[PDB]
């Protein structure tokens, strides 16, 4: 009826289409035909069942990984945000960062002519416009997106601003950098990843308040306060950031039986120069504590009148335990020295 010539006896036929039909070349083009003429609605409903080929087995892992993460954040208290993947070449300046490696040949606007190399510039920029529309006292949020450098990368950045948390009516607040860190530490605590920060110089980050991030054993992203110069180049007050690269590495849990024998408790302080980073401090004490150090925490410190003008004090609570048996004091005040020795012996 469609003007095709059908020769042959079957089961496979010779069908020559009319010339006005340029869309008809393959056998499938021919099938689409019987379909539409008979009517797509006349095709029944069904569901397939089969064992997927093996190499398809783990596939979902990465995607899922990202989502559990995305989810954990919103649960920790971060409002999610979606930012355009574009970038204003100009901000490469406004925000002290290298230039975008990819540019558009047909930009939508000269302000969206490059491809974001970083995620935070956009967050910060969102911060501003929110302030101008509604005046939020504080704000904590994150975003996950694809940035473009040499290769396409999945990044994660978060921004904090405001008075902070505490009693609304009651005066005090507790906020700032150490608040953003607080959350971060908790997040990894929840992810089962050992994280720490070390001071690092960042062009876009106010120094002193600048720091590189070390997910479990590794360097990825940074964290710190937004460099004031930029803070002000924009009608904006102080902001706190961090931007990492995903996927985060993972430490497969090795379960471990905790022992019932009570731990060995200790009171200890360390006096070291005002410049020394908490880091190396904890590090040393820790690396010399010995193999039975169950806990290591810092309950206090202050510069201190009663000591060297250029040194500080450190409240360190200590705990020890031995799985099979209880720790004999012989080993405790002994190992303790093992530390104090190489402690400032260094």
């Amino acid at each position: 009826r469609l003007g095709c010539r059908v020769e042959g006896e079957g089961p496979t036929y010779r069908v020559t289409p009319p010339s006005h039909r340029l869309d008809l070349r393959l056998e499938e083009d021919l099938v689409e035909e019987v379909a539409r003429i008979q009517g797509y609605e006349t095709i029944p409903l069904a569901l397939p069942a089969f064992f997927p080929a093996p190499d398809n087995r783990g596939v979902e892992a990465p995607y899922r990984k990202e989502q559990r993460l995305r989810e954990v954040l919103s649960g920790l208290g971060f409002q999610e945000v979606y930012t355009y993947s574009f970038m204003d070449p100009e901000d490469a300046r406004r925000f002290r960062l290298d230039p975008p490696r990819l540019l558009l040949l047909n930009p939508l606007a000269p302000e969206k002519a490059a491809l974001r190399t970083h995620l935070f510039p956009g967050l910060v920029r969102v911060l501003k416009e929110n302030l101008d529309l509604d005046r939020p006292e504080r704000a904590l949020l994150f975003e996950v997106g694809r940035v473009f450098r040499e290769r396409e990368e999945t990044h994660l950045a978060g921004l904090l601003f405001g008075e902070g948390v505490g009693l609304p009516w009651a005066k005090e607040r507790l906020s700032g950098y150490f608040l953003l860190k607080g959350y971060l530490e908790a997040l990894f605590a929840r992810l089962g990843l050992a994280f720490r920060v070390e001071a690092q110089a960042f062009p876009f980050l106010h120094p002193g308040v600048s720091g590189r991030v070390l997910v479990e054993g590794e360097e990825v992203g940074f964290l710190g306060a937004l460099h004031p110069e930029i803070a002000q180049e924009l009608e904006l007050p102080p902001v706190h950031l961090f931007e990492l690269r995903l996927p985060l590495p993972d430490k497969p849990l090795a379960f471990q039986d905790p022992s019932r024998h009570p731990a060995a408790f200790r009171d200890l302080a360390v006096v070291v120069p005002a410049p020394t980073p908490y880091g190396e401090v904890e590090a040393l004490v820790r690396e010399a504590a010995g193999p039975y150090l169950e806990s290591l925490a810092l309950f206090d410190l202050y510069q201190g009148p009663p000591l060297p003008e250029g040194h500080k004090s450190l409240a360190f609570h200590l705990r020890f335990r031995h799985p099979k048996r209880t720790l004999r004091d012989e080993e405790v005040e002994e190992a303790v020295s093992r530390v104090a020795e190489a402690l400032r012996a260094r």
Partner: protein, 265 residues
Amino acid sequence: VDVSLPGASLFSGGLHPITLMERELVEIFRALGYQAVEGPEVESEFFNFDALNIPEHHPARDMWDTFWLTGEGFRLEGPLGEEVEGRLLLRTHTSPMQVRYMVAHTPPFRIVVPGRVFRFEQTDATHEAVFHQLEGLVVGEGIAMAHLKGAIYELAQALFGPDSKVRFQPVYFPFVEPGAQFAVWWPEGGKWLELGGAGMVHPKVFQAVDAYRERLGLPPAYRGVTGFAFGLGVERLAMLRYGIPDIRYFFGGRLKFLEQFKGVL
């Protein structure tokens, strides 16, 4: 400023390993089109034993050491929100839910049922009195055993494998003929693991279902349909998976243990 310093002590939450394992098992079956539903921990002798082809005075009633209850004014709800009667007890396995569901619904369907069950045995490191199981039921016309076999196989693959495989040995259960106990191939540790039991739903169970349905005014729905069900020990599996040694560890509210699974996902 000293950035290497600790931040504001903020609470980092975690999830119980059983919840974790539950969730994983569920996500798995969800992918085969199974739906997760729950039942009550306090059941009627009717749903726990009678409904399933389990006799009063015969050797069957004697495989499960039950916890009987007493007390008045306690209202037990039936599949349809009706009050039911029977000596009260603590569900001995999750199977009862097979019945509450079938009474309240129409085939074909696929369900999986996680649940805390109770048994009177002495608590050792591989056995407890309070543990969880996961029940599975698929009813529909045409259902065959090969489907139950496929189902289980997809589970092994999903847990270990594809270098892993499934073991089905005949065993006896009052509510399924053919009955079977099944083991999974753990390529890693290199041993066979006896996971649970399963079989083709017993005719007498379908019978019971319709009979109770008509008693409630509903039309019979399980005449001429087939089905398989299975049920497995969750702790037995969580232990093997998350590498735990003492089953008693689960109900021992020790934080040092609990926190060990903080980042399981």
